[PDB]
Amino acid sequence: SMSVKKPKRDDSKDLALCSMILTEMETHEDAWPFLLPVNLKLVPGYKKVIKKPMDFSTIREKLSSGQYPNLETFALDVRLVFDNCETFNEDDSDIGRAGHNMRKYFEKKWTDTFK
Numbered sequence: 133s134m135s136v137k138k139p140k141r142d143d144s145k146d147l148a149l150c151s152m153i154l155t156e157m158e159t160h161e162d163a164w165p166f167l168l169p170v171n172l173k174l175v176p177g178y179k180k181v182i183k184k185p186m187d188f189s190t191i192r193e194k195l196s197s198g199q200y201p202n203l204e205t206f207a208l209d210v211r212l213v214f215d216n217c218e219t220f221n222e223d224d225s226d227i228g229r230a231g232h233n234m235r236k237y238f239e240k241k242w243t244d245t246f247k
Contacts (some may be wrong), residue, residue: 146202148247150203153238154192160234160237162233163230165190166217166234169185213234
């Protein structure tokens, strides 16, 4: 509360470490469905169903331009990419399975890096 603060967690490396995690997601062989925004003109149903589209290139631009106020807002956009994928793709599709694999990969890096 006022003038009563919990000890200061060192966040000075958070930007660089989120960038590294994002690089590892970008270079994973199963990243291909997630590299670019879904083409809303060419994928019927996507625009109406998926209210907040997100992809790795968009996260990379947000990260590079100071649009994440903290590491939690970054993890929220990563998870959005997988939640969108699960909403639109069957679990037993190439893209569906990609999304499960990448979420697992991400969550392990996240825990090992920050928790």
